[PDB]
Amino acid sequence: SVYDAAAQLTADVKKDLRDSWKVIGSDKKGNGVALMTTLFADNQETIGYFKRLGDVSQGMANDKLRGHSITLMYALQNYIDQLDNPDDLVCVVEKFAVNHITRKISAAEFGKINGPIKKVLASKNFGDKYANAWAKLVAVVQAAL
Amino acid sequence: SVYDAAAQLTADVKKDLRDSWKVIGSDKKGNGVALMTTLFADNQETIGYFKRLGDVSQGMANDKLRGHSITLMYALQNYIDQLDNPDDLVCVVEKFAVNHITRKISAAEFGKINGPIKKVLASKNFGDKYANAWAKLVAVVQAAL
Ligand code: HEM
Ligand code: HEM
């Protein structure tokens, strides 16, 4: 269950998640856009899903993409803030899951975000230990897809 | 015009929004649900739009409503954080506007949130002065609907 996946996040994992988010979460517009552009660069097959955003090659200049990227970073902010209360983490995770279920995004496809997250983390010197911690949070969302 | 509306956010208005947000934003779950239940209680004709959340009369006990409410407070958090940059404030407002346009929500009905906000603020000892400041921020979203 999603509850089982959340309830398993350990103190060491939450610690790594919070320490790293302190940095990558400080520049939501910059890191959010880089997050999306990297996804499009390494997984071109996903581009079609974001047709509403127009030409995503525009990057920062694309106001629709910029608005989306910033808002996505707040979804991650939401997750990070609910870490110490699985009950709340679960209800928010399930809320965003619906957003993706409606767009026919599978658990496997949603996991494609791990690559970009790993690279964004790396750009700030957060290694594999930190990439692994984030894959665990993403897995909580996958449990709901 | 969303850009003209954004221009209405003067230094004094931005200050009042931040000061009051520091209090209201400290308890997103509690104040978020309070906002929603007050809306449903004072404007029962809007409950139909929230069919997906189930029985909203259950308030806090309703997982979907709680997840929705917390997330809603993060939308307001997003707005507050974009106050320094008008271009970014507009792109996020337009992003959330689409979320409501697709649900057939007009500027007029979106404005029904002013009642709940004034009441939630009043219970925290923030009067009309602060209620009006928030009305201006809400007015920015209305301009995009
Ligand atoms: C860290 C992981 C991710 C987070 C936190 C996240 C968050 C969000 C949020 C907040 C929205 C806006 C929901 C709405 O207003 O309808 C969204 C939309 C969307 N997401 Fe994700 N997402 C993530 C990963 C992904 C991945 C990997 C894919 C695709 C493989 C994906 C596909 C979509 C699509 C198609 C939309 C709709 C975009 C639009 O038309 O506006 N998401 N996501
Ligand atoms: C302070 C003002 C408000 C803010 C910041 C706000 C924010 C949000 C957010 C973030 C969502 C989730 C978007 C999504 O995932 O699709 C949402 C959904 C929604 N909002 Fe609002 N909203 C506000 C006022 C209103 C009002 C006054 C109405 C109704 C008269 C309304 C009707 C809706 C509806 C129908 C949904 C869909 C809920 C669902 O089925 O999940 N909103 N809103």
Swiss-Prot record, chains A, B:
Heme b binds at H100. Gene3D superfamilies: Globins. CDD domains: Mb-like. Residues 8-145 form the Globin domain. It comes from the Eukaryota. One of its GO terms (molecular function) is metal ion binding. It is found in: Cytoplasm. Its main location: cytoplasm. InterPro entries: Globin (IPR000971), Globin-like_OT (IPR050532), Globin-like_sf (IPR009050), Globin/Proto (IPR012292), Mb-like_M (IPR044399). Keywords: Cytoplasm, Heme, Iron, Metal-binding, Oxygen transport, Transport. One of its GO terms (cellular component) is cytoplasm. Homodimer. Belongs to the globin family. This is Globin-1. It comes from Anadara inaequivalvis.
